[PDB]
């Protein structure tokens, strides 16, 4: 297929970045200069928007169990700017700390982690899911 073949059948899936559709492209084989050819055309055309893919991270890592300094960071080497990153952060209508004290309940029960093995286990977890500290604190009652 064409690289503007190959790239519209990725966002069919799913909106795509900019720089993860070049870079899909570019693994396939796809010449740099060529590669981003076929990501501004589908741009241009409708198909492509660096804001929607923003907004759908922050909807789709949300629901997932992770936090906002995983995603920040994950949106960050999508090439999107500080402003831009900000944007799609302020699309989130839910609570941060909420999510890190289900993703708990949903691992260890109501009561939380017990004993210490536990409680770091949760504090490790919570960390690599990229949660504050406030919230980390909070959900293994530190």
């Given at each position: 297929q064409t690289p503007?073949?190959?790239?519209?059948?990725?966002?069919?899936?799913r909106e795509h970045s900019k720089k993860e559709l070049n870079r899909k492209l570019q693994a396939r084989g796809i010449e740099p200069e060529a590669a981003q050819?076929?990501?501004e055309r589908l741009?241009?055309?409708?198909?492509?928007?660096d804001v929607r893919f923003?907004?759908?991270?922050?909807?789709?890592?949300?629901?997932?169990?992770y936090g906002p300094l995983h995603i920040r960071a994950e949106?960050?080497?999508h090439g999107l700017?500080?402003?831009a990153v900000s944007a799609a952060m302020a699309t989130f209508e839910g609570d941060w700390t909420?999510?890190?004290?289900?993703?708990?309940?949903?691992?260890?029960?109501?009561?939380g982690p017990v004993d210490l093995a536990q409680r770091r286990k949760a504090a490790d977890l919570l960390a690599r899911r990229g949660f504050d500290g406030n919230?980390?604190?909070?959900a293994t009652r530190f």
């Open positions: 503007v073949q190959r790239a519209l059948g990725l966002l069919v899936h050819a076929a990501v741009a241009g055309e409708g198909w492509q928007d923003a907004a759908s991270v922050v909807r789709n890592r949300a629901s997932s169990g949106l960050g080497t700017d500080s402003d909420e999510n890190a004290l289900d993703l708990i309940r949903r691992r260890f029960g109501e009561d919230s980390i604190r909070l």
